[PDB]
UniProtKB/Swiss-Prot annotation, chain B:
Protein name: Gamma-tubulin complex component 3 homolog
Organism lineage string: Eukaryota, Metazoa, Chordata, Craniata, Vertebrata
Subunit composition and interactions: Interacts with gamma-tubulin.
Protein source organism: Xenopus laevis
Entry function: Necessary for the recruitment of gamma-tubulin to the centrosome and for the formation of a functional centrosome.
Family membership: Belongs to the TUBGCP family.
Compartment(s) of residence: Cytoplasm, Cytoskeleton, Microtubule organizing center, Centrosome
Curated annotation (Swiss-Prot), chain C:
Name of the molecule in the record: Mitotic-spindle organizing protein 1
Alphabetical keyword list: Cytoplasm, Cytoskeleton
GO cellular component: centrosome; cytoplasm; gamma-tubulin ring complex; interphase microtubule organizing center; spindle
Function: Required for gamma-tubulin complex recruitment to the centrosome.
Entry similarity comment: Belongs to the MOZART1 family.
Subcellular location: Cytoplasm, Cytoskeleton, Microtubule organizing center, Centrosome; Cytoplasm, Cytoskeleton, Spindle
Highest taxon of source: Eukaryota
Subunit record text: Part of the gamma-tubulin complex.
Name of the gene encoding the protein in the UniProt record: mzt1
Residues of the full protein shown: 8 to 59 of 72
Length: 93, 263, 52, 250
């Protein structure tokens, strides 16, 4: 936890330590007081939000393509907690 | 149960299940023989059966696509446009089954939202094959001309794909006859039929006519008579058609002024 | 190890389509936070600021 | 006792799709435009009276499934056909909310009150969509008075911040064809109606009428402004658009 989140500041900001310190403070505060998910767990709802996003933008081909990509992610059987990963990538589109 | 979640997949491709059926042209309803306590989860999969029924009307259309050479030139160009949307319909069956083999169980209600986006698309292709029984060209142009005036924005997108490929043989006829004076017929699917009597050296004489009863509705009646005068003198994308026949009319009259110079 | 490489490739493809502007390094960190049971809502907010 | 709630939660979810229950059966009374549901006797009478609270959600759902059947049966090309296309969208996003609940019963659980407070965000949206659909069920309207009707309802709802947004998406998909045929009048004075979908109907100078089968936007005078622009071409904030659109083409 403590290390990974600091790593996040460091790669984005492109600065080492004692440069990212204040930013660290915001990040720590904001992650810690809301640590655990505040939504009911459900892979399907997040997926649907990603495909509607494709349709709304009229990128139909990519919306179908996406469906193939999510099955590939799921199939490998390595990453669990998948909804949160997907969720994040959708919020930042 | 899991065996039913798979079984509904096959009925999407229009392929009869692993249970006995007495439907395939009525809907695609399955009777297991213990359908009695499956009367709530058989009823969900009876709504999905009705999607597989609408797939089969498009499929039998495609058996009429190509014969030893099926009647029309536009009749089959239409059928090419209808097979493309069937092809895209297959794409979601091909992700759906590949989820039903990962390290499995996909919920009936989850897959219902997956079949809802095809259910506004395929249903309006099956409505579009109902207006047509004949394949004769220009009938098909009046079908998509009758369906792009209708409400609902979601099938209006779908018929605009189809407008672009139905119309494309109409326009391939049109621009050759305006510029050089040359024509194409294969079955008399152009709205110009040829030889009312017999051919006669040009001076403008009755040789072509509008042939209403197979006219594409893309043109209005005074604009079909305009492009007739243009073609004898040389001798929405529905509304882009009437613009450039006005720009054709000025280029063909220079040619008509050259005929005075020969006499 | 190999499945872990293949899986990351899938995720990179999920990223390109959505225009996130996350690199191979930024995505891998995000995943790791995500796997520890952090709320994605909070996580997205932090990221936006870090790009400022 | 916790078991009698669990299977009725599952039965309630089956009804909300639009599909017959195990212990909740559907009897048509008005032809399933409002369903007279009967849940059959259960041993525990407490769980049966709570189950009744959740069945009017499904009665209001039958109102909207007859709305999208209704406008298709007539084959309009009107903006009523497109009002239903929105209600099919609100109906596609609904189904994700039931199917989640369905997913939650598979592994893990939802009791009756766990049901109750998740349904509770959408029984209110259903009932606002249901009342726009029942007021419209008279076999009317054609283009302009559909629009007139939906504007009065948006100006009614004013001060409940809830229906301002929900009536916002409906009134702009309804206006999506309407501002097409509006432009055709203010820049060419020509009509584009498959039926009569534009208020100023036709039949130089020309023989224009207006009808109150296609009531003007909120005010009769701006429809009279568009009467007067089109002749010259031949020789809240939305009606406002017209008064200066006339007077730049005068």
């Amino acid at each position: 936890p403590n290390v990974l989140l600091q790593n996040l500041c460091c790669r984005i900001l492109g600065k080492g330590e004692a440069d990212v310190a204040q930013q660290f403070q915001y990040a720590v505060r904001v992650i810690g007081s809301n640590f655990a998910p505040t939504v009911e767990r459900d892979e399907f709802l997040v997926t649907e939000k990603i495909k509607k996003e494709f349709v709304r933008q009229r990128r139909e081909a990519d919306g179908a393509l996406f469906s193939e990509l999510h099955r590939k992610l799921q199939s490998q059987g390595v990453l669990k907690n998948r909804w949160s990963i997907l969720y994040l990538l959708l919020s930042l589109s | 149960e899991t065996s039913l979640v798979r079984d509904l997949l096959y009925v999407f491709q229009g392929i009869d299940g692993k249970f006995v059926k007495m439907c395939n042209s009525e809907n695609c309803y399955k009777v297991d023989g213990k359908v009695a306590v499956s009367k709530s989860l058989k009823d969900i999969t009876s709504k999905l059966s009705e999607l597989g029924w609408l797939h089969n009307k498009i499929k039998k259309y495609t058996d009429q696509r190509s014969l030893d050479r099926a009647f029309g030139l536009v009749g089959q160009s239409f059928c090419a446009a209808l097979h493309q949307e069937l092809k895209e319909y297959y794409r979601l069956l091909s992700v759906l089954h590949s989820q039903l083999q990962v390290e499995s169980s996909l919920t009936l209600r989850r897959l219902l939202v997956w079949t809802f986006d095809p259910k506004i698309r395929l249903k309006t292709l099956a409505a579009l094959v109902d207006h047509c029984q004949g394949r004769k060209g220009g009938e098909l142009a009046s079908a998509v001309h009758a369906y792009t005036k209708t409400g609902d924005p979601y099938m209006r997108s779908l018929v605009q794909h189809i407008l672009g490929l139905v119309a494309y043989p109409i326009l391939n006829f049109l621009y050759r006859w305006i510029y050089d004076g040359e024509l194409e017929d294969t079955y008399h699917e152009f709205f110009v039929a040829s030889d009312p009597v017999v051919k006669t050296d040009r001076l403008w004489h009755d040789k072509y006519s509008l042939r209403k009863s197979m006219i594409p509705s893309f043109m209005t009646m005074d604009q079909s008579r305009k492009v007739l005068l243009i073609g004898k003198s040389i001798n929405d994308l529905e509304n882009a058609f009437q613009t450039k026949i006005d720009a054709a009319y000025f280029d063909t009259s220079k040619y008509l002024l050259d005929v005075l110079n020969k006499n | 190890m190999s499945a872990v490489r293949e899986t990351m490739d899938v995720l990179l493809e999920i990223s390109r389509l959505l225009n996130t502007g996350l690199d191979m390094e930024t995505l891998s960190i995000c995943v790791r936070l995500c796997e520890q049971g952090i709320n994605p809502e909070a996580l997205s907010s932090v990221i936006k600021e870090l790009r400022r | 006792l916790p078991s009698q709630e669990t299977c009725l939660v599952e039965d309630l979810l089956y009804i909300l799709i639009g599909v017959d229950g195990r212990y909740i059966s559907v009897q048509p009374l008005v032809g399933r435009q409002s369903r007279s549901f009967s849940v059959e006797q259960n041993l525990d009478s407490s769980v049966k009276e709570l189950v009744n609270r959740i069945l009017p959600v499904a009665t209001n759902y039958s109102t909207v499934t007859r709305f999208v059947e209704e406008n298709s049966s007539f084959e309009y090309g009107q903006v009523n056909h497109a009002l239903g296309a929105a209600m099919r969208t609100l109906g596609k996003e609904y189904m994700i909310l039931i199917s989640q609940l369905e997913h939650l019963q598979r592994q893990g659980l939802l009791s009756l009150q766990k049901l109750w407070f998740y349904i509770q965000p959408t029984l209110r949206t259903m009932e606002v969509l249901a009342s726009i659909a029942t007021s419209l069920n008279k076999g009317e309207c054609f283009g302009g008075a559909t629009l007139s009707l939906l504007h009065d309802r948006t100006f009614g709802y004013t001060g409940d911040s809830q229906a301002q947004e929900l009536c916002l998406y409906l009134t702009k998909a309804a206006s999506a064809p309407y501002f097409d045929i509006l432009e055709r009048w203010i820049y060419r004075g020509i009509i584009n109606d498959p039926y009569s979908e534009f208020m100023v109907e036709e039949h130089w100078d020309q023989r224009y009428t207006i009808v109150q089968q296609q009531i003007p936007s909120f005010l009769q005078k701006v429809a009279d402004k568009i009467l007067s622009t089109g002749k010259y071409l031949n020789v809240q904030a939305y009606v406002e658009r017209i008064e200066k659109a006339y007077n730049y083409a005068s």
